[model samples]
Every structure is written in C-alpha cells, then in structure tokens.
Target chain A: VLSQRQRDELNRAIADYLRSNGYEEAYSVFKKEAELDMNEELDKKYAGLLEKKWTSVIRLQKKVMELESKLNEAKE
Target chain B: VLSQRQRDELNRAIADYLRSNGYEEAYSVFKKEAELDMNEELDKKYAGLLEKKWTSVIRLQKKVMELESKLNEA
Candidate 1:
C-alpha cells in the first residue's frame, strides 16, 4: 500500500546505489520496472544518500545506547 | 537479507517520517522491533527527509518522462 512517492523514494535510492556500485543487472531491472531514465539528474540527484542515511542511523544507535546505559546505571 | 546498515538506513527514514507525522503507535512498534531509543538525535536526524526524498523521485520521474518523450518525438 505504499504511495507512488514512497515507492519512488526507496526505489531511487536503491537504483542509484546499485548503479554506482556495479550492480547493473539488478539496476537494469530497477530501471525497466520503475521506468527510470539514465540521466544525470537521476544519476546524480540524491546519490549515495542511502549510504549516508545508514551511517547516521548507526550513529544514533550508538548514542542512544550510550545514554540509555547511563540511565540504567543511575537507576541502579 | 539486508545488512544491519541497510536496515538502519531504511528504518530510520521511516522512523522519523512516522514520528513527525502523528503515527506514534506504529512508531512504537518500530522502536520495539528495532530496539530503537528515544532521543533527540533519533527524533531530529533525517527529519522531513523521506518526504523530501519522495519529492525528488517525483521530479526525476517527471523529467525522465519529458526527455524520453522528446526523444521519441524526434
């Protein structure tokens, strides 16, 4: 039940990721299925963003663990 | 099978998107399933980004259609 926008957001991230990372076969599928174009805008727009997004989540995970552990120590 | 990083990337996007958009119960499920924490970092980082990301995709879709149409018309 994803919106067209939701599907596109996730799809484009993976599409660019795959293209940049030598996953051309799968990317072909992505392009064909999603009706994507081989253009600089699609290629360059938001490129590598998912990778950056993941790292930020990991940073959040580590900081959250740090703060929560400190909270537990204080509770103890 | 998604890598931990892959899961985190997609999850965090949806997480912030859900939280800011009044989808708390589902967000609670995300928090529980992913062992996510309540923090300003998690709350604020990447806020409004998935929405932006979606718009960019729409833009791409529109532009691609425009260019391909011109290519075909020629």
Candidate 2:
C-alpha cells in the first residue's frame, strides 16, 4: 500500500522530470502509445523499459531530497 | 507479459526518483500508507490526484528518453 506522502513524492519527482524534459516529445510518445494501444506483449516491453527509468528517477529524487536536507541543515 | 527490459526500466525510473527524492521520506510515506491500508475508495481518491501528476511526469520522462535517443542518433 502507498501513502499520500509517498504518492505525493512520486508525483513531485515525475513532475520535475517532465518539466525538465520537453513536453511535446513526451506528449507525442504518449499519444502514439495511446493510439496504437500496444498489445500486452508490446506493452510489457515498453513497461519494462519504463520501469528501469522509473527506478533511476526514484533513486535520484531520494538523493536530491537528502542532499537538499543536508544542505539546509548545514546552512542553519 | 512484462519483458525483463520493461520491468528493469520501470524499476530504474522508480529507483531514480526514490534516490533523487529521498528514500527515507518515500519509504516512510510508503510504510505509513501501507500500515493504514486504505480502502479502494480512498485509493481511488489518491490515484485520481496522482493520475493528474502522473500524466505530467509520464510526459516528461517520454521527452527525456526521446531526446536521449535523438542525441544518440546524432
């Protein structure tokens, strides 16, 4: 089960990534994927790729938060 | 069925996000949520809000992947 805070953190990380990257390209891929409606097999392929990326993203986000906190503490 | 690659990617993305954000916070939140054991109704509410944010994140991730590919091609 996920928590609201966890969910929020995940949401925030995604938001940052999306904002950092180009939205149009992302939209195109999303649209393409949606329109094609890939078969379960193909989706699995895509999902597999996505999952790796997600893991990396999550890890990075965690580091960022930690570093930020440490920096903040140091400053204080 | 999910391909090893897809699972890897999803896992990677989640990992990256968790790492960059703060595993402790994320884990805490995850743990708290887990303990609460929210019902479907509550989950739906959370999911609903999350979906909106997810849309944006998914969009961004796609772009990053695309740009990386393009760069690779160039």
Candidate 3:
C-alpha cells in the first residue's frame, strides 16, 4: 500500500519509462492526461531507471531461456 | 508509434494493473480521471497481466543476481 505521494512517484516512473523509450505517442498523451506534476526534476537522477529495469528484465529473461535451451540440447 | 486506440489500450492496461494491485486509492482516482470508457470490460481477459509482468521481472532479476553473487563468492 503506497501513500499518495508514493503512488504519484510510481506513476511518474512509468511515465519516464515511456518517455525515454519509443512510446512517445503514448507518452505524449499520458503526459498531458496523467497530470503527474513533473515537478522536482526527475531528469536529474531517475532517468532511464525504469527503462533499464525493463530492458534488463527482457534481456535476462531471454538469457536464462537461452541457457535452458542449451542445457536441454546437452542432455543433462 | 501506437495509434490512438493502442495508446488508449495501454493506458487501460496500466489502469488495470493498478486496479488489481493494492493501489486502490490511486487506482480509484486514476480510474475516474482517465475516462478510459471502460467499454470493453477488460476483466474478461488481461487480468493481472502487468502484475505478472512486474512480479516476474522482480523475481528473475533477484534470482539471477543471486546466482551471480554465488558465482562470485565461490
């Protein structure tokens, strides 16, 4: 359970992920609509934080899946 | 570039994730503020989808990072 401010922060993180990634169409719409208060200059520190998190999630998921594939092929 | 509909759908997906998880206050506020039309009754499908995504991201990141720590130690 997050406080109001924490919820707002998480929402902003999601926005930032979309902002940095290629979802600018969605990002533009969400930016205008979500009203995240984009104050406090999140750019100074948290840029790419969620983008990195997601890309790594995708990267590692593929990495482990490939490892498992090789393990299966090796018959152990 | 996602079309306007796709953008709306993704917005709904984010909203749905919040709706299912414990962010009910935010969920409630976003649900109303978003005016997503809620016309499709997304509950018939896609429930917990983003939660599943996020949980697995956290889970596997921890799982693999832990494995790396062991490899480093040993």
Task: Say which candidate scores most in DockQ.
Answer: 3
Q: Which candidate number would show the highest lDDT if scored against the true structure?
A: 1
Candidate 1 lDDT at B67 equals 50
lDDT of 2 at A17: 36
Go through the candidates in order and give each one's C-alpha lDDT: 0.61, 0.41, 0.58
A36-60 per-residue lDDT for model 2 (tens digits): 2334454334433332343345554
- Evaluated against the true structure, the overall lDDT of model 3 is 0.58
* Per-prediction TM-score: 0.46, 0.26, 0.47
In model 3, which runs have C-alpha deviations exceeding 4 angstroms?
A1-12, A18-58, A65-76, B1-10, B18-40
Task: Give the C-alpha miss distance for residue A37 in model 1, angstroms.
Answer: 31
User: In terms of DockQ, which candidate is stronger, 1 or 3?
Assistant: 3
Candidate 3: tens digits of C-alpha lDDT, residues A1-76: 4467644655677677556645555455555555655544875455655445544566887766765555556565
After superposition, the stretches of candidate 1 with alpha carbons farther than 4 Å from their true spots are A1-76, B1-3
Ranking by TM-score, best first?
3, 1, 2
Which 10 successive residues of model 1 chain A have the least lDDT summed? A53-62
> What DockQ does each candidate score versus the true complex, computed on alpha carbons?
0.04, 0.04, 0.18
Pairs that clash in candidate 3: none
Candidate 1, B-chain TM: 0.81
Give lDDT tens digits, candidate 2, residues B15-64.
33333334434433432422334444544444333334455455556655
